[PDB]
Ligand binder design. Structure first.
Ligand SMILES: Nc1ncnc2c1ncn2[C@@H]1O[C@H](CSCC[C@H](N)C(=O)O)[C@@H](O)[C@H]1O
Ligand SMILES: Nc1ncnc2c1ncn2[C@@H]1O[C@H](CSCC[C@H](N)C(=O)O)[C@@H](O)[C@H]1O
Ligand SMILES: [Cl-]
Lengths: 278, 286
C-alpha cells in the first residue's frame, strides 16, 4: 500500500460509514469510498501545490520526503523539474530509489540521506521547498529554517503542512511568526484545515478496524502505533487543542522586518478557513 | 501645499478643522502637530512595508510637487527617485525644490505620461502611486506600463479607491475613474501583481476631513486670506469627498502589491480577491 494512500485528507463533512484505514487497505470494497479517500487526499495537497506555476519552476526540494510519493507525482506531472528529497533513513532512501527507477525518473528525481536541520541540499537556490508534517518532527527549528531559507530562491515558494499548538515538538502561533519572520519568509496565505482533517480521520469503529486490520493484513507494531497516533491527532483537532494549517510562504529579503512580522501574524492568527474556498 | 494631503484620524476630533489648521486660522500647535502626524500616518501604512536600505530605485508615477520622493531621498541617501507629472510647471517647481535641497543628482521629475511613456529605468524596486490611478482612464495601459518596469519581487504601493456603488465611480475632482472590486482583481492579476495587503482607511480619512463648520471656515479663509476659485473649488471637493466616504459609495484603500511571475494565475486571482473584498481595517493596526 503506497504511503500516499495513508496520508491525511480533507472531508467537508464526516461520512457516517467511512473509515480511512479500511478504505486505504482495501478492506472496504466501496468504489465511492475509495474515490472519496483519494479525492480528499489530493484536495489537501492541492491547497499548497495549486499556488505554484510549476511551468516556471526548475527545482523542488522536499526536505522530509518519506518514500518520495509526492516528488514522484510532481516529477511525473512536470517533465522538466528536478526534484530532490531528504530522509534520515538509509533504507527509506533505498526504497525511494527503487520506486524512482521503476518509473524512469532516475535522471532528475533523487532521494538523499541528509538531515535537513543541518545538511545543505544539492542546489544553491530551489524554486519550491515542500514540507508535509516535517518541521514539527525536527527539534532544532532555527537551524532548519536557516538551512531551508538559505537554499530558497528569492521569491521562491515554501509550502508547509504542519501543526499549531493552541494550548512531537509543538509550535505556538507566536513561535511560527518568529521562525518564519527571522528567516525572511513572508506568508502569502495560511489555510486552516483542522476540522476537515478531523472529519477524514474520524472512524467510529477505529479500534475494531485496527484489530481487524492486524489479523487480516500484516502491520508492524510500528505501523499500528503510527495509526493510533493519527486517530489521537484527529481527536486533538476536534478539540481544537491543535490546528492543522497549510502555509504558503515566499522568500522575501526586501520587506521590512517589522512589517514582515505584521503580515505573518495576520495569517498565523487569522488563517483562511478551508470551507470558504473555490 | 503638502499640508493639503489627506490624513487618518482614528475618531472625529471636535473643533478640528483640517482647513483652519492647514492655513493657520487655528493657532493651536497641538492641532498642527495632529494634522502633520495624521498625514504621515497615512503615508506610513504604505512606506513602512519596504526595506528601503535594500532598494535602489523608486518611481513615483504621479508625483505632484515631488514632496514624497524628496522626503524619501533625504531619508535614504543611496536611493534614486524618479517622478512623473503631466504638467509643465509642476516639474519646474519640483526640480527647483529638488535643487534647493542638494538632491539634484538622485531625484528627478520628468514630464511623462505614465499611462503610455516608459520611465527612465527598466526595473524599479518600488513604484509609488498616491491617488494617481484614479485620474487615469486607461487602466490596462497604465498597469502594463507599471508592471513591465517593476523588478521581479518589487513593490507597487498605491493609495487609491474602490467603487462600491454606481455613484462612487466618479467623485468630483478627487476620484475621477474608480473601479469595482472585481475590476481591481483583474487589473492586478492580469499584470502579475500580487497583493500582500489592502488597508481600508475610508472612515479615518472621513474623520480627518470632517468639519461641521466647514462653510463658515471657508468664508473666513476667503475673507482673511486670498484663495482663488480653483483653490476654493478643490476645498469644497475635499469636503464632499469626505461625505462620500461616509456614505461608502467608494472606499479609500492602500494597496501593497508585488510583481510575482511565478504564482499560478488562478491562485493569483484568489489571493487578490481576498484582499480587495476583505481589506484590513486600519483600526485593527497597532
Ligand atoms: N531532520 C530531518 N532531515 C531530513 N528528513 C527528516 C528529518 N526529520 C524527519 N525527516 C523525514 O520526514 C519523513 C517523515 S515526516 C512525515 C512524512 C512525509 N511528510 C511524507 O510525505 O512521507 C521521513 O522521511 C523522515 O526521514
Ligand atoms: N497619466 C499621468 N502620467 C503621469 N502623471 C500623472 C498622470 N495623471 C495624473 N498625473 C499626476 O498626478 C498628480 C496629481 S494626483 C496628486 C497626488 C500626488 N501623489 C501628490 O502627492 O501630489 C499630478 O502631478 C499629475 O500630473
Ligand atoms: Cl491623468
Amino acid at each position: 500500500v503506497d504511503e500516499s494512500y495513508l496520508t491525511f485528507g480533507v472531508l467537508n463533512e464526516k461520512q457516517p460509514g467511512f473509515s480511512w484505514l479500511r478504505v486505504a487497505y482495501g478492506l472496504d470494497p466501496s468504489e465511492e469510498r475509495m474515490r472519496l479517500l483519494l479525492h480528499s487526499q489530493r484536495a489537501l495537497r492541492n491547497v499548497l501545490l495549486d499556488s505554484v506555476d510549476f511551468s516556471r519552476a526548475k527545482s523542488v526540494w522536499d526536505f522530509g520526503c518519506g518514500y518520495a510519493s509526492d516528488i514522484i507525482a510532481l516529477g511525473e506531472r512536470h517533465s522538466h523539474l528536478k526534484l530532490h528529497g531528504h530522509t534520515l533513513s538509509s533504507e527509506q532512501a533505498e526504497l525511494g530509489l527503487r520506486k524512482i527507477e521503476a518509473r524512469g525518473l532516475g535522471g532528475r528525481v533523487q532521494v538523499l540521506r541528509r538531515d535537513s536541520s543541518k545538511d545543505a541540499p544539492l542546489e544553491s537556490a530551489y524554486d519550491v521547498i515542500l514540507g508535509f508534517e516535517v518541521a514539527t518532527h525536527i527539534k532544532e527549528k532555527r537551524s532548519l529554517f536557516q538551512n531551508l531559507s538559505s537554499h530558497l530562491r528569492e521569491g521562491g515558494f515554501m509550502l508547509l503542512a504542519d501543526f499549531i499548538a493552541n494550548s512531537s515538538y509543538n509550535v505556538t502561533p507566536s513561535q511560527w511568526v518568529e521562525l518564519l519572520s527571522e528567516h525572511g519568509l513572508r506568508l502569502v496565505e495560511c489555510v486552516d484545515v483542522s476540522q476537515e482533517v478531523a472529519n477524514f480521520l474520524f472512524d467510529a469503529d477505529f479500534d475494531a478496524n485496527l484489530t481487524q486490520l492486524e489479523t487480516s493484513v500484516g502491520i508492524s507494531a510500528i505501523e499500528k502505533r503510527n495509526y493510533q497516533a493519527m486517530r489521537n491527532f484527529g481527536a486533538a483537532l476536534e478539540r481544537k487543542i491543535l490546528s492543522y494549517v497549510l502555509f504558503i510562504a515566499q522568500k522575501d529579503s526586501h520587506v521590512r522586518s517589522t512589517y514582515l512580522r505584521h503580515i505573518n501574524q495576520k495569517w498565523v492568527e487569522a488563517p483562511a478557513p478551508y470551507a470558504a474556498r473555490e
